Paper text:
SPS catalyzes sucrose-6-phosphate (S6P) synthesis by using [name]-glucose and fructose-6-phosphate. All SPSs identified so far belong to the GT-B type glucosyltransferase family and contain two Rossmann-type folds. [name] SPS is a kind of [name] (EC 2.4.1.14).
In order to study the function of TeSPS A- and B- domains, we generated three truncated proteins. All three truncated proteins were easily purified from E.coli. However, only the second protein (residues 27–220 and 406–426) could be crystallized and resolved to 1.92 Å with structural statistics provided in Table 1. The A-domain could be merged perfectly with the A-domain of the full-length enzyme with an RMSD of 1.3 Å. Unlike the first truncated protein, this one has the α6 helix at the C-terminus, implying that the α6 helix in this position is important for domain folding. In the full-length enzyme, loop 1 is key to binding [name] and loop 2 is close to S6P. In apo-TeSPS, these loops are likely flexible and appear to be important for enzyme-substrate binding. In the absence of [name] binding, loop 1 was crystallographically invisible in the A-domain structure. MD analysis of the A-domain shows that RMSD values of loop 1 and loop 2 are higher than those in the full-length enzyme.
Author numbering: 25 to 36, 53 to 159, 174 to 241
Write the structure that this text describes.
Amino acid sequence: HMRQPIALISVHIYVRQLGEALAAAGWHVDMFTRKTDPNDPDVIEHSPHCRTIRLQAGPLTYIPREKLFETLPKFVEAFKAYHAKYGYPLIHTNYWLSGWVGWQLRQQFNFQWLHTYHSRDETRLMVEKAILENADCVIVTSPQEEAYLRRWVSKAGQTRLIPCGTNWEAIALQMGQLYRQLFAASL
């Protein structure tokens, strides 16, 4: 629908399943995550318009989320080689760490930026505030996490409820609709 090459970013199963259901509905989807082994493949094609791209960004090993922040400037540089060619009009970031990447990108480029929230503290809170303030839309997966965000992080920004679940077709349809809403708001 609406506008073509979209990028989902998950530095660290939410994104993999979303992008495949999105592409089933017709979106051209490139999903980016980090490499965690030097024998990892660079591109995994799932369908003619859906693939996962694994970027070398920090050590070629499994790094847990609580140690990933320092790898993000490298993830931004690796991603910028793909964004330099594909020019993604929409980028959808997953978890606050990928959102830092989205935040850095949005400071340099003009794209529709959506972010999905999920539930060191000093860094996370400042970054989560920056994302809420500058992203076009932040997705929460339950009222309880929306309640937490508004209580403990910030009241700023636009949040939308797309609930946790195992029906990825349904989720993708709701996400797709948001994408198109964002794109039409160009006026």
